[PDB]
Amino acid sequence: NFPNSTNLPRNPSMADYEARIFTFGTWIYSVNKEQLARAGFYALGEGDKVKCFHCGGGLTDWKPSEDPWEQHAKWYPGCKYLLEQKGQEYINNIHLTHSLEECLVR
Ligand SMILES: Brc1cnn(C2CC[NH2+]CC2)c1
Ligand SMILES: [Zn+2]
Structure with a gap:
Protein backbone atom coordinates (compact mmCIF):
# COMPACT_ATOMS: atom_id res chain seq x y z
CA ASN A 1 0.00 0.00 0.00
CA PHE A 2 1.57 3.30 -1.20
CA PRO A 3 2.12 6.28 1.18
CA ASN A 4 -0.25 9.29 0.95
CA SER A 5 1.63 12.43 -0.10
CA THR A 6 -1.38 14.70 -0.72
CA ASN A 7 -2.46 17.47 1.67
CA LEU A 8 -5.55 15.40 2.55
CA PRO A 9 -5.44 12.82 5.37
CA ARG A 10 -6.03 9.15 4.56
CA ASN A 11 -7.90 8.57 7.84
CA PRO A 12 -9.78 11.79 8.78
CA SER A 13 -11.61 10.03 11.71
CA MET A 14 -8.16 9.97 13.40
CA ALA A 15 -7.35 13.68 12.65
CA ASP A 16 -7.95 14.87 16.23
CA TYR A 17 -5.27 14.19 18.87
CA GLU A 18 -7.87 12.98 21.43
CA ALA A 19 -9.34 10.46 18.93
CA ARG A 20 -5.87 8.96 18.37
CA ILE A 21 -5.25 8.74 22.15
CA LEU A 59 5.56 1.65 12.13
CA THR A 60 6.35 -1.32 14.36
CA ASP A 61 8.83 -2.85 16.90
CA TRP A 62 9.64 0.28 18.87
CA LYS A 63 12.88 0.52 20.91
CA PRO A 64 13.03 2.90 23.96
CA SER A 65 15.63 5.23 22.37
CA GLU A 66 13.57 5.83 19.17
CA ASP A 67 11.67 9.08 18.55
CA PRO A 68 8.15 9.07 16.90
CA TRP A 69 8.81 12.27 14.84
CA GLU A 70 12.24 11.00 13.71
CA GLN A 71 10.84 7.60 12.71
CA HIS A 72 7.95 9.31 10.90
CA ALA A 73 10.49 11.37 8.88
CA LYS A 74 12.73 8.37 8.27
CA TRP A 75 10.12 6.04 6.78
CA TYR A 76 7.42 8.45 5.52
CA PRO A 77 9.34 11.58 4.38
CA GLY A 78 6.55 12.55 1.94
CA CYS A 79 3.96 13.02 4.74
CA LYS A 80 2.25 16.40 4.60
CA TYR A 81 1.23 16.32 8.31
CA LEU A 82 4.93 15.85 9.16
CA LEU A 83 5.91 18.79 6.89
CA GLU A 84 3.20 20.96 8.44
CA GLN A 85 4.15 20.26 12.07
CA LYS A 86 7.96 20.20 11.76
CA GLY A 87 9.07 22.21 8.71
CA GLN A 88 11.46 21.24 5.90
CA GLU A 89 14.61 22.24 7.84
CA TYR A 90 13.89 19.73 10.66
CA ILE A 91 13.09 17.08 8.04
CA ASN A 92 16.36 17.75 6.21
CA ASN A 93 18.35 17.40 9.48
CA ILE A 94 16.74 14.03 10.28
CA HIS A 95 17.50 12.61 6.81
CA LEU A 96 21.06 13.84 6.91
CA THR A 97 21.48 12.43 10.46
CA HIS A 98 20.25 8.97 9.47
CA SER A 99 22.05 8.79 6.11
CA LEU A 100 25.25 9.75 7.99
CA GLU A 101 24.46 7.28 10.79
CA GLU A 102 24.91 4.56 8.13
CA CYS A 103 28.51 5.56 7.17
CA LEU A 104 29.46 5.68 10.90
CA VAL A 105 29.65 1.91 11.51
CA ARG A 106 27.69 0.45 8.51
BR1 LIG B 1 8.58 0.64 7.45
C1 LIG B 1 8.89 0.39 9.29
C2 LIG B 1 8.14 -0.34 10.18
N1 LIG B 1 8.68 -0.28 11.39
N2 LIG B 1 9.78 0.51 11.22
C3 LIG B 1 10.66 0.83 12.34
C4 LIG B 1 9.92 1.64 13.40
C5 LIG B 1 10.78 1.89 14.63
N3 LIG B 1 11.31 0.61 15.16
C6 LIG B 1 12.14 -0.10 14.15
C7 LIG B 1 11.30 -0.43 12.92
C8 LIG B 1 9.90 0.91 9.95
ZN1 LIG C 1 2.35 10.70 8.23
Whole structure:
Protein backbone atom coordinates (compact mmCIF):
# COMPACT_ATOMS: atom_id res chain seq x y z
CA ASN A 1 0.00 0.00 0.00
CA PHE A 2 1.57 3.30 -1.20
CA PRO A 3 2.12 6.28 1.18
CA ASN A 4 -0.25 9.29 0.95
CA SER A 5 1.63 12.43 -0.10
CA THR A 6 -1.38 14.70 -0.72
CA ASN A 7 -2.46 17.47 1.67
CA LEU A 8 -5.55 15.40 2.55
CA PRO A 9 -5.44 12.82 5.37
CA ARG A 10 -6.03 9.15 4.56
CA ASN A 11 -7.90 8.57 7.84
CA PRO A 12 -9.78 11.79 8.78
CA SER A 13 -11.61 10.03 11.71
CA MET A 14 -8.16 9.97 13.40
CA ALA A 15 -7.35 13.68 12.65
CA ASP A 16 -7.95 14.87 16.23
CA TYR A 17 -5.27 14.19 18.87
CA GLU A 18 -7.87 12.98 21.43
CA ALA A 19 -9.34 10.46 18.93
CA ARG A 20 -5.87 8.96 18.37
CA ILE A 21 -5.25 8.74 22.15
CA PHE A 22 -8.29 6.46 22.73
CA THR A 23 -6.88 3.82 20.33
CA PHE A 24 -3.94 2.86 22.59
CA GLY A 25 -5.72 1.93 25.82
CA THR A 26 -3.26 0.75 28.46
CA TRP A 27 0.06 0.91 26.61
CA ILE A 28 2.94 -1.23 27.90
CA TYR A 29 5.32 -0.45 25.06
CA SER A 30 8.63 1.39 25.36
CA VAL A 31 7.58 4.54 23.48
CA ASN A 32 5.22 7.05 25.14
CA LYS A 33 1.63 7.04 23.74
CA GLU A 34 1.16 10.82 24.11
CA GLN A 35 4.33 11.31 22.04
CA LEU A 36 3.10 8.87 19.41
CA ALA A 37 -0.28 10.58 19.17
CA ARG A 38 1.33 14.05 18.93
CA ALA A 39 3.36 12.71 15.96
CA GLY A 40 0.13 11.80 14.16
CA PHE A 41 0.01 8.15 15.19
CA TYR A 42 -2.84 5.94 16.42
CA ALA A 43 -2.68 2.29 17.57
CA LEU A 44 -3.87 -0.70 15.55
CA GLY A 45 -4.05 -3.06 18.54
CA GLU A 46 -1.37 -5.38 17.05
CA GLY A 47 1.50 -5.17 19.57
CA ASP A 48 3.15 -1.73 19.19
CA LYS A 49 2.08 -1.27 15.56
CA VAL A 50 0.92 2.36 14.90
CA LYS A 51 -0.35 4.13 11.75
CA CYS A 52 -0.19 7.86 10.83
CA PHE A 53 -3.66 9.28 10.22
CA HIS A 54 -2.44 11.46 7.34
CA CYS A 55 0.08 9.46 5.31
CA GLY A 56 -1.17 6.00 6.31
CA GLY A 57 2.39 5.04 7.21
CA GLY A 58 2.81 2.02 9.50
CA LEU A 59 5.56 1.65 12.13
CA THR A 60 6.35 -1.32 14.36
CA ASP A 61 8.83 -2.85 16.90
CA TRP A 62 9.64 0.28 18.87
CA LYS A 63 12.88 0.52 20.91
CA PRO A 64 13.03 2.90 23.96
CA SER A 65 15.63 5.23 22.37
CA GLU A 66 13.57 5.83 19.17
CA ASP A 67 11.67 9.08 18.55
CA PRO A 68 8.15 9.07 16.90
CA TRP A 69 8.81 12.27 14.84
CA GLU A 70 12.24 11.00 13.71
CA GLN A 71 10.84 7.60 12.71
CA HIS A 72 7.95 9.31 10.90
CA ALA A 73 10.49 11.37 8.88
CA LYS A 74 12.73 8.37 8.27
CA TRP A 75 10.12 6.04 6.78
CA TYR A 76 7.42 8.45 5.52
CA PRO A 77 9.34 11.58 4.38
CA GLY A 78 6.55 12.55 1.94
CA CYS A 79 3.96 13.02 4.74
CA LYS A 80 2.25 16.40 4.60
CA TYR A 81 1.23 16.32 8.31
CA LEU A 82 4.93 15.85 9.16
CA LEU A 83 5.91 18.79 6.89
CA GLU A 84 3.20 20.96 8.44
CA GLN A 85 4.15 20.26 12.07
CA LYS A 86 7.96 20.20 11.76
CA GLY A 87 9.07 22.21 8.71
CA GLN A 88 11.46 21.24 5.90
CA GLU A 89 14.61 22.24 7.84
CA TYR A 90 13.89 19.73 10.66
CA ILE A 91 13.09 17.08 8.04
CA ASN A 92 16.36 17.75 6.21
CA ASN A 93 18.35 17.40 9.48
CA ILE A 94 16.74 14.03 10.28
CA HIS A 95 17.50 12.61 6.81
CA LEU A 96 21.06 13.84 6.91
CA THR A 97 21.48 12.43 10.46
CA HIS A 98 20.25 8.97 9.47
CA SER A 99 22.05 8.79 6.11
CA LEU A 100 25.25 9.75 7.99
CA GLU A 101 24.46 7.28 10.79
CA GLU A 102 24.91 4.56 8.13
CA CYS A 103 28.51 5.56 7.17
CA LEU A 104 29.46 5.68 10.90
CA VAL A 105 29.65 1.91 11.51
CA ARG A 106 27.69 0.45 8.51
BR1 LIG B 1 8.58 0.64 7.45
C1 LIG B 1 8.89 0.39 9.29
C2 LIG B 1 8.14 -0.34 10.18
N1 LIG B 1 8.68 -0.28 11.39
N2 LIG B 1 9.78 0.51 11.22
C3 LIG B 1 10.66 0.83 12.34
C4 LIG B 1 9.92 1.64 13.40
C5 LIG B 1 10.78 1.89 14.63
N3 LIG B 1 11.31 0.61 15.16
C6 LIG B 1 12.14 -0.10 14.15
C7 LIG B 1 11.30 -0.43 12.92
C8 LIG B 1 9.90 0.91 9.95
ZN1 LIG C 1 2.35 10.70 8.23
